[PDB]
């Protein structure tokens, strides 16, 4: 049910001017663990 | 400009650095050559007349 | 909710790309980009915390 | 009888989430807000700010270094001000999210790991127990009461 | 030579609702599935527009003002409207723009003319050879000082045709900014009696001209001895542009699909 | 030229980036192409009719990993967000004894092991780095 | 305490109070007034919540 | 704010537009930054409440 | 005229608004009247006092 609002604006996704998004330290899977 | 450890000393302004992760020295691939493109222009001025 | 998305901003490439004279104009403004990266670094740490 | 009521309630929970699409809104908008915040950050790149152009090269390729500092100074001031606004908003929003996360951790430590007597802390009615479920950027408690 | 035509039917002017017509691409940047807002000169939705028609008894060709671009639409059969005049005074006190869709050529020029009271072009009606030969070109009295001309490739087009419903829906909009004439247009096959349809249609950019003159008034030109005539039915509609602010939506292939007035 | 980061001028449109043959279907009068960000990413070549995708060539921040200077003087480097097939663009830690690929990017200066312990220095994606025998 | 009074400040009528050239010269500054109105309306909704 | 006056209409009553813009830039800067201060302080107080 | 939204011009001092009769008991050396925000709110008509 959860979807992001804009596609490409939350693997090659580097923004054109200096915007980066850091992956979380804990991934999806071990939280479920 | 010598080594990453010295880069940490240079940007944290200390001769001691404790354990962890730090963020320095943002980079860019720095493109090689130049290029220009323009239409195939053919309508000359008749100077021969 | 638990956390937002961590994000980070390179100050100089945000402000002006490729213009070293813009960097010369920027470097008289003190150390603002250090503050900016420090604040975003603190937020990004607190997310995982 | 309790087993039948419990299983029926769980099936109704599945049906209630699979039916109503407006349930996860408390998670969603935060993400949306961050998105549009980043979005409007990009939209401040293409302002004039009283300078002649928003293209930095075109100012450089038309106006001379005896005078071009005046225009690029305006561009510096405008873009720096936009960064100020963006990160002040981010700090306030992050403090708010931290407060909600502390509330979540308290709920996980009391409602799940034990049995609290605080009325309406762990949902409506007399609290029996809780189960947690993971969620994108969040947690979902199922209180059994 | 140019004569005054008098024998007609007299009627008051008519207005028609321009429902949602007259949208054009503001630039040449391609988008895909994008809601983007602009602000520019546009024809407002649901205005009333001037409706003129040549029937049977009608030769309705006056001089109209040109301010901030105009939108011109025509429902026609067999291409009776041929020309456009532009200029401040049309009488060699100011420069003058001449656009002609000849049966042979299309002629585009600016010189310093003196146009007549009723400039028009006259074609005969089935002169024993099943061809309508164009015989009369009565536009200006002279061409004093010339500054720019252009003529395209010659061609042939049909000067004859009779239909119970007009097939040609030709849509144009003309703008003048900083010495530049902008002609934006669209052609459409259509089946309607005496009206303009409801629907969406963008205008592709077609022509820019770097002319550099002041333009205030204009008039179009019609196809048809000095009295005695035979013209087919045609009709056109004239609307004016106002600076407005719109929202436009682009599909995946990048055509403007629908528009929103603010 | 193609497949390299270059700075370019297409008909008064200057920029920098790597160019790619594209699949976008222009209308014939259309020249540029933009984003939702109103940033140019699609340019039609004036000489020959084709669509060119523009990608800004890559970049990133440098992460540096160390124990304390009371402990050691050996460090490691993370190039974030980069499949490090083009790493070297100091230089001495550009080809040193291994490269390791993570969801964060390229790790250089640490050797990947199989065992799993508790986290020491949080790098990311469940990956942590430490100093041991 | 429970809430405060909900306030609203119109950006344009505050800054360029009934001037046309001032609005036009304001227009080059991006989209501040939208951000300010959005923040204030969010506060005012939050009070009733 | 360093300009001739703080009255908007008087400057337009006396100056040509190529200098009215010079004054009104400084005026719009001062007023805008004051409004920025006000909205930030309001956000902090709303979070406290 | 009174009681209409109009443009007004008193001694070069101009503005837009509605004029009504006051009861402010001036002293003869005074002409104008000001507000907290340095805006004109009470004007002596030059022709009729
Ligand atoms: C708006 C439009 O016509 N889009 C077309 C789509 O219908 C077609 O299926 C596809 C196949 O390449 O190409 C595109
Ligand atoms: C491909 C690879 O790394 N394989 C290793 C294996 O050699 C090692 O024995 C084991 C630990 O028991 O972990 C795994
Ligand atoms: C106080 C005073 O001098 N009032 C005069 C008035 O008597 C005269 O009729 C009018 C004509 O312009 O000008 C004013
Ligand atoms: C437009 O003209 C028509 C002509 O009949 C008239 O009925 C209508 O009221 C007019 N609308 C406006 C907005 O002027």
Residue numbers in the entry:
A (entry chain B): 825 to 834, 850 to 872
B (entry chain A): 292 to 340
C (entry chain B), G (entry chain C): 728 to 776
D (entry chain B): 922 to 1066
E (entry chain B): 14 to 69, 77 to 244, 254 to 291
F (entry chain A): 534 to 622, 633 to 676
H (entry chain C): 970 to 1018
I (entry chain B): 534 to 582
Publication excerpt:
SARS-CoV-2 spike protein plays a key role in mediating viral entry and inducing host immune responses. It can adopt either an open or closed conformation based on the position of its receptor-binding domain (RBD). On newly packaged virus particles, the trimeric spike protein has a pre-fusion structure in which three receptor-binding S1 subunits sit on top of a trimeric membrane-fusion S2 stalk. During viral entry, a receptor-binding domain (RBD) in S1 binds to a receptor on host cell surface for viral attachment and S2 switches to a post-fusion structure for the fusion of viral and host membranes.
